[PDB]
Amino acid sequence: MSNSVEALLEISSSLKALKEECVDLCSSVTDGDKVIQSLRLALTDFHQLTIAFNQIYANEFQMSPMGPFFQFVHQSLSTCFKELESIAQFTETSENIVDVVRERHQSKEKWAGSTISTLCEKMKELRQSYEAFQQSSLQD
Amino acid sequence: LQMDNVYEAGKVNLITVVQLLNEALKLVSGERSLYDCKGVRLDLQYLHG
Amino acid sequence: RDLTLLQREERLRDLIEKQDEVLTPVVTSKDPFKDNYTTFATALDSTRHGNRHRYLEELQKHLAITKSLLEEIMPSHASENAESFDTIKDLENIV
Amino acid sequence: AEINQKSLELELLRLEKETADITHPLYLGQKHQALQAMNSHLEAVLREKRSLRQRLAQNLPIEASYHRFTAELLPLAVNFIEKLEIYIKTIQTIPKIPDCASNMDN
Numbered sequence: 017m018s019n020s021v022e023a024l025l026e027i028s029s030s031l032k033a034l035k036e037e038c039v040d041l042c043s044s045v046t047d048g049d050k051v052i053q054s055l056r057l058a059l060t061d062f063h064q065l066t067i068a069f070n071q072i073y074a075n076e077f078q079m080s081p082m083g084p085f086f087q088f089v090h091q092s093l094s095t096c097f098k099e100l101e102s103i104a105q106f107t108e109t110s111e112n113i114v115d116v117v118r119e120r121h122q123s124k125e126k127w128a129g130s131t132i133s134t135l136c137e138k139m140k141e142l143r144q145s146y147e148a149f150q151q152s153s154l155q156d
Numbered sequence: 157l158q159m160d161n162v163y164e165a166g167k168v169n170l171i172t173v174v175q176l177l178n179e180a181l182k183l184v185s186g187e188r189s190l191y192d193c194k195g196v197r198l199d200l201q202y203l204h205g
Numbered sequence: 206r207d208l209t210l211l212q213r214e215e216r217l218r219d220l221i222e223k224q225d226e227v228l229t230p231v232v233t234s235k236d237p238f239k240d241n242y243t244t245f246a247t248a249l250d251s252t253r254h255g256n257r258h259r260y261l262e263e264l265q266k267h268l269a270i271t272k273s274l275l276e277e278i279m280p281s282h283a284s285e286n287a288e289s290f291d292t293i294k295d296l297e298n299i300v
Numbered sequence: 301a302e303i304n305q306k307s308l309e310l311e312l313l314r315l316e317k318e319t320a321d322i323t324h325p326l327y328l329g330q331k332h333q334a335l336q337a338m339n340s341h342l343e344a345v346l347r348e349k350r351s352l353r354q355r356l357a358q359n360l361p362i363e364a365s366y367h368r369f370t371a372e373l374l375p376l377a378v379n380f381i382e383k384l385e386i387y388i389k390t391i392q393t394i395p396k397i398p399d400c401a402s403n404m405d406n
Contacts, residue, residue, distance in 0.1 A: 081354015083366030098287035110400035195280030
């Protein structure tokens with residue numbers, strides 16, 4: 017009795033381990049027969065096309081032949097267009113950015129009170145004022 | 157450059173156009189050889205950064 | 206147990222036989238194809254970098270020049286440069 | 301009796317696993333797909349044999365796969381020719397491009 021019970025526990029554990037390894041194999045019984053038929057057709061076609069290619073390669077490669085020239089010239093010319101436009105845009109943008117920043121540093125406006133100043137000057141004045149205020153508080 | 161008229165019998169001569177295109181491309185080739193010998197690269201990563 | 210195992214082996218044999226019949230012709234013609242195709246593809250890749258027939262022949266002569274000029278003028282990074290245009294415009298607007 | 305049943309089940313499952321690559325629908329399906337892609341490609345190559353031959357050797361009777369490229373080539377060429385001067389100026393600015401980039405950074 018004790019030997020039989022131990023044999024059941026061992027086999028049950030082996031089965032559980034194998035079922036887990038075979039999770040992908042357990043899904044939907046699609047008609048195995050249909051897949052094979054389809055495969056048969058594909059292989060047969062493949063074989064026929066390979067022969068047809070080899071024949072054309074030996075005889076002709078080893079309707080006007082103009083189609084590939086048009087495609088090439090079209091794609092190459094288009095790329096050339098776009099590239100030059102991009103170079104032109106970079107130059108323009110770089111110059112615009114330099115001007116905008118320059119104008120901001122040199123422009124004088126009435127920010128606060130009765131005095132006209134640049135943004136940098138007024139900001140410095142404001143900073144000095146609060147430095148002065150803070151120094152007067154640390155000496156307390 | 158033996159080139160026919162761009163327009164023959166009121167219609168566009170595609171061969172002439174292509175010939176003109178070829179001349180234009182030669183000019184462009186000449187200019188690129190003078191000013192873009194190494195080919196200008198716009199660092200796309202730099203600009204994105 | 207014996208009956209159940211025999212039924213499954215018979216099914217496996219049927220399936221293998223059906224496949225062998227169709228695979229054998231394809232494996233035999235493989236090596237000549239692969240070699241002819243590769244040589245063909247490499248040859249094609251080296252080219253990329255009145256009477257109406259008579260007309261298309263004259264046109265081909267000039268397009269061949271065009272193709273040669275474009276291969277000469279186009280830098281190696283031309284395609285990358287062409288993609289940078291939008292990014293440049295975005296930078297300007299943000300500033 | 302219970303041990304015998306489970307033992308059979310185990311034996312059956314083992315046989316199925318060992319022959320899955322050639323027998324299971326899943327694996328067979330993947331092989332089909334790879335084969336269909338190549339077929340289509342070869343069909344195309346055979347259809348454009350004339351054009352491909354002409355390239356290797358280097359209504360209007362042109363192969364249908366190339367009608368687009370042929371029809372659009374004219375406008376493209378016209379546009380290039382008309383903008384030729386602009387393209388030349390642009391090419392002249394190419395040596396300034398590093399300075400432009402430095403000034404902008406500053």
